[PDB]
Amino acid sequence: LFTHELQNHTATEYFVSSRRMFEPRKPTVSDFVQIESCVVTYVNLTRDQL
Amino acid sequence: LFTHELQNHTATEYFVSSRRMFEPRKPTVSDFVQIESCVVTYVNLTRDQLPDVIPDYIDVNKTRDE
Ligand SMILES: *[C@@H]1O[C@H](CO)[C@@H](O[C@@H]2O[C@H](CO)[C@@H](O[C@@H]3O[C@H](CO[C@H]4O[C@H](CO)[C@@H](O)[C@H](O)[C@@H]4O)[C@@H](O)[C@H](O)[C@@H]3O)[C@H](O)[C@H]2NC(C)=O)[C@H](O)[C@H]1NC(C)=O
Ligand SMILES: *[C@@H]1O[C@H](CO)[C@@H](O[C@@H]2O[C@H](CO)[C@@H](O[C@@H]3O[C@H](CO)[C@@H](O)[C@H](O)[C@@H]3O)[C@H](O)[C@H]2NC(C)=O)[C@H](O)[C@H]1NC(C)=O
Ligand SMILES: *[C@@H]1O[C@H](CO)[C@@H](O)[C@H](O)[C@H]1NC(C)=O
C-alpha cells in the first residue's frame, strides 16, 4: 500500500500494488489483517473514516 | 473458474478449482476482486443474478430496503 501524490491538495490516494510490479488499485477489505498491538509507526484514525 | 455444463438447457453451473486438479466449488466473494474495466470476454450480467450465480454474495442494499 502506498500513498501516491501528497496531502498538499487534500487527496491522499491509498493504493496497493505488487512490490515487483507497479499496479495501483484500491485494496479490498478481505485482504488486510487485524492486529491487537499498536506502535508509533501506525497511522491514527477513528472508526468513522474506515 | 469454470462452467459445468452449458447454456444449452440454460444451466451453466459455475464452479472453481485448482488449475491442475478437479476440486469443484461454487465461486465465492472472498475469491475475487473488482475492476473498473470490461471486455467482451467478460460475461455480462445484471445485479439481481449475482446472488444467483454467487450465493456467497450478499447484497446489503437490496435486503435492508425490504
Ligand atoms: C455485455 O458486455 C460485453 C462486454 O464484455 C458486450 O460485448 C460487447 O458487445 C458490444 C455489442 O453488444 C460490442 O459493440 C459492437 O461492436 C460492433 C463492431 O463493429 C464493427 O463490426 C461491424 C460489423 O462487422 C462493422 O460494420 C463496423 O464498422 C465495425 O467494424 C459494432 O458494429 C456495434 O455497433 C457495437 O458497437 C462490443 O465490441 C463488445 N465488447 C468488446 C470488447 O468487443 C456485450 O455486448 C454486452 N451485452 C449486450 C447484450 O450487448
Ligand atoms: C499516533 O498516536 C500515537 C499516540 O497518540 C503517537 O505517538 C505518541 O506521540 C506523543 C507525542 O510525542 C508521545 O508523547 C510524548 O512521549 C515522549 C516520550 O517518548 C515525551 O517526551 C513527551 O513529553 C510526550 O509524552 C507518545 O508517547 C507517543 N505514543 C505512541 C504510542 O507512539 C503517534 O505519533 C501517532 N502517529 C500517527 C501517524 O498518527
Ligand atoms: C442501498 O441501495 C438502495 C438502492 O440501490 C437504496 O434504496 C438503499 O437505501 C441503500 N442502502 C444502503 C444501506 O446504502
DSSP readout, A4-50?
Answer: ES-GGGS--EEE---SSS----PPPGGGS---S---TTSPP--GGG-
CA dist B14 and A45 (Å) reads 41
Q: Is A5 left (phi over 0), alpha (psi -120 to 50) or beta?
A: left
Q: For residue B3, give the H/E element and its range.
A: strand B2-4
Q: For testing the chain A interface, which of B28, B29, B31, B33 should be mutated: the one with the most A CBs within 10 Å? A: B33
Pairing of β A13-15 and β A2-4: antiparallel
CA dist B66 and B52 (Å) reads 18
B33 touches chain A (CB under 8 A): yes
Q: Which of B13, B2, B5 is nearest to B53 (CA)?
A: B13
CA dist B58 and B47 (Å) reads 11
Please tell me the distance in Å from B5's CA to the nearest CA on chain A. Answer: 31
Q: The C-alpha cell of A21 is what?
A: 510490479
Core vs surface per residue B41-53: b (16+ CB within 10 A) or e: eeeeeeeeebeee
Which experiment gave this structure? cryo-EM
Write the CA distances from A49 to A20, A45, A46, B34, B62, integer angstroms: 30, 7, 6, 21, 24
Resolution in A: 6.4
Q: Which of B53, B38, B48, B46 is nearest to B7 (CA)?
A: B53
Q: For residue B37, give the H/E element and its range.
A: none
Chain A residue with minimum CA distance to B34: A28
A18 touches chain B (CB under 8 A): no
